[PDB]
Amino acid sequence: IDLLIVEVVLFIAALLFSGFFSSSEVALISITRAKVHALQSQGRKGAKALDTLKRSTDAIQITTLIGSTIANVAVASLATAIGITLYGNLGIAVGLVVAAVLVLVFGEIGPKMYASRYTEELALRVSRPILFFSKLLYPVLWVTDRIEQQFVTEPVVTEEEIKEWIDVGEEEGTIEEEERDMLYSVLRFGDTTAREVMTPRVDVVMIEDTATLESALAIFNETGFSRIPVYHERIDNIVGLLNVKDVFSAQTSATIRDLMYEPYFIPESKKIDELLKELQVKKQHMAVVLDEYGSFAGIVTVEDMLEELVLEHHHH
Amino acid sequence: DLLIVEVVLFIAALLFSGFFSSSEVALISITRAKVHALQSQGRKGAKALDTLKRSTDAIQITTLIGSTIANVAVASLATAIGITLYGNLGIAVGLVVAAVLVLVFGEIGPKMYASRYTEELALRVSRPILFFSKLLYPVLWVTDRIEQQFAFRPGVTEPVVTEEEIKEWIDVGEEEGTIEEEERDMLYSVLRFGDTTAREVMTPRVDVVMIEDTATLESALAIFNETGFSRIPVYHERIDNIVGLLNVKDVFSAQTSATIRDLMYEPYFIPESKKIDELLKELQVKKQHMAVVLDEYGSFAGIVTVEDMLEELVLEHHHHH
Ligand SMILES: CCCCCCCCCCCO[C@@H]1O[C@H](CO)[C@@H](O[C@H]2O[C@H](CO)[C@@H](O)[C@H](O)[C@H]2O)[C@H](O)[C@H]1O
Ligand SMILES: CCCCCCCCCCCO[C@@H]1O[C@H](CO)[C@@H](O[C@H]2O[C@H](CO)[C@@H](O)[C@H](O)[C@H]2O)[C@H](O)[C@H]1O
Ligand SMILES: CCCCCCCCCCCO[C@@H]1O[C@H](CO)[C@@H](O[C@H]2O[C@H](CO)[C@@H](O)[C@H](O)[C@H]2O)[C@H](O)[C@H]1O
Ligand SMILES: Nc1ncnc2c1ncn2[C@@H]1O[C@H](COP(=O)(O)OP(=O)(O)OP(=O)(O)O)[C@@H](O)[C@H]1O
Ligand SMILES: Nc1ncnc2c1ncn2[C@@H]1O[C@H](COP(=O)(O)OP(=O)(O)OP(=O)(O)O)[C@@H](O)[C@H]1O
Ligand SMILES: [Mg+2]
Ligand SMILES: [Mg+2]
Ligand SMILES: [Mg+2]
């Protein structure tokens, strides 16, 4: 009874350590190094010590493995010690069963489940102690890091794991087979620039602002297009977009410059995700692209970006 | 004596502890291309490996429960054996000893050994670990219902994966950096875009501009040049009955001897409850920009153009935490 009281606290304390190391492992190895260096530049409390741990992901796995294993071993080495003193030789089992059922719930699975909901907030909190324990285990680290001269875990939620849950959607009907492809496209659609999908000026059909109104229809009805850029004595110099509908319903005296409208000029590095929205806000369809020198380069239509997101994807 | 019963279970548990740890690494380290090759080659333990990898979470919970249970058993028998010899100094002798044995033989050891022998070991352990996996089905059932977690969700217990659940996953992706902040707002947008139907983004019949198929082109151009549109439906003796669609780009480029019925083209009729995520792909595949919505009785109720759906997709997009 005397020592038993002192043993149930080490049992509880070791359980918290095992949970602390197990939950710390999930949050730490899940933050994208691209995002860690973002929090560090912002200077948030914990990012510096977190970028340190990311410098050697092998240090995050060994620390949490050893700190937890040591704890887990102590969590049960005492649970049976307490068990036997309470239940004789039947305590090695009783103490064993009541230990394995708590190392699983509060020292392994529970701590891992909790850390997934709060992964950025917890990673910044356990950056200091985990980096501290890693220093204490520098002997054991060098032992396992030195063998690296004699010949990585992934986050709880990977972009592939998400993609897979969507495929489950298509399979179960909750998600149309058409928007699975669109959901797949969005993920491969934010880092895309307009230059990657623009129509090179070479293949563009345009018209000079000095041309004849009637002569413009010769282009529309011959090329079948509905919107052609307009240029001013230089293919480089785009001064307006001409809409075919305006020419069909044109007055008897109007000229090319009367029915053209100011184009939305954009760079070659324009993200097409925000351009599909900027065009949808102007009620406009075409966007003129300019290179680094302001010279014409190509055009981009809402029909281009639409083709991107609607493109059909492969099923795994 | 009872000691002999303890030291034997101590080793056996230490082998299980190392069997699961090394089976987890080997089963997960192996690439999807290697399994597909072993699948076609048809080697022993491949078919059971292909299924075992379908849910990478089911592999970690079984190898964890296994390695954890065994590890505790290794420690239990050390604190017990040592206690039988060293009284209460055994709890320390057991803890300290077990703490090093599990680490070097149940954890770190089995892990490093698996990284170099991923192929051979995965096949020899795909069968036993898969067997255990089916025993853990009760645990896999509960885990797949706790939707506040994202660590152990096997998805092999037939869960209801609805738009709600995917959003939960995407929210986590943005928080850890695997998904960018901006490309999450897009997923939430298209996620709710699929819920929208045709009627909710259509133009009601009352606002539509049509032209009777018995009119003349001189009248057709007048409509376009007045309403500004580029396409208008066509009917026959009744407003409920739509028979085609007319485009100005063709009426302007119409032969001297032309008509409205020969210039119009068959429309794509759709119900009011039509999903626009499908219609957007279908309209984009038929090269057409406008559909025709028909109410339950197959009468003209409105139209849905590509632009009508892009507004719902873009300007009215969702985002939440
Ligand atoms: C809920 C579960 C709870 C289980 C138990 C959790 C135990 C947490 C472990 C506490 C470790 O405490 C840790 O000690 C070290 C040494 O001071 C601190 O690190 C310190 O080290 C450097 C120098 O080495 C000091 O200059 C500086 O004050 C501090 O960074 C660290 O900030 C703290 O985090
Ligand atoms: C589960 C049991 C695991 C084993 C227990 C741990 C045993 C640790 C034995 C290794 C001693 O650990 C470590 O050895 C190296 C020797 O090069 C020491 O480092 C020394 O060599 C390295 C280069 O290799 C130098 O960078 C460093 O400045 C020097 O101090 C280090 O100070 C010591 O901390
Ligand atoms: C931290 C994780 C802790 C995990 C704790 C594990 C608890 C195990 C005991 C609970 C087992 O839970 C029980 O398992 C069976 C599958 O075998 C479930 O499924 C069974 O019943 C449902 C209906 O409710 C049926 O649809 C299904 O076909 C059948 O297999 C059952 O609904 C659930 O009531
Ligand atoms: N004047 C143009 N010159 C060269 N290419 C063009 C021109 N206009 C559009 N395109 C190209 O056609 C592709 C599809 O664009 P889009 O379908 O919107 O033309 P459109 O048939 O006139 O459209 P709409 O009929 O809706 O007005 C674009 O990728 C673009 O590169
Ligand atoms: N005949 C029509 N009657 C009523 N609404 C129409 C008609 N045609 C199009 N609309 C509506 O106008 C809006 C925009 O559609 P849309 O952009 O396709 O027409 P458009 O601008 O004349 O064609 P385009 O832009 O390709 O030249 C949509 O809400 C659509 O429902
Ligand atoms: Mg077009
Ligand atoms: Mg082990
Ligand atoms: Mg329009």
Residue numbers in the entry:
A (entry chain B): 4 to 154, 160 to 258, 263 to 328
B (entry chain A): 5 to 258, 263 to 329
List sentences from the manuscript.
CNNM/CorB proteins are a broadly conserved family of integral membrane proteins with close to 90,000 protein sequences known. Structurally, CNNM/CorB proteins are defined by a conserved core consisting of a transmembrane domain (TMD) and a cytosolic cystathionine-β-synthase (CBS)-pair domain. Here, we determine the crystal structure of an archaeal CorB ortholog in two distinct conformations (apo and Mg2+-ATP-bound).
After extensive construct and detergent optimizations, we ultimately obtained diffracting crystals of MtCorBΔC with an internal loop deletion (MtCorBΔCΔloop) purified in UDM in complex with Mg2+-ATP. The final structure, consisting of chain A (residues 5–322) and chain B (residues 4–154 and 160–322), is refined to 3.25 Å with an R-free of 0.27. Although MtCorB is present as a dimer, it does not show C2 symmetry. Overlaying the TMD of two polypeptide chains reveals asymmetry in the positions of the cytosolic domains, primarily due to differences in the linker between the TMD and AHB. The homodimeric TMD exists in an inward-facing conformation with dimerization predominantly formed by hydrophobic contacts of TM2 and TM3 of each protomer. Electrostatic surface potential analysis reveals a large, negatively charged cavity that has a maximum diameter of approximately 10 Å and is lined with conserved polar residues. A second conserved feature is a π-helical turn in TM3, in which the helix is composed of an i + 5 instead of i + 4 configurations, resulting in a bulge in the helix.
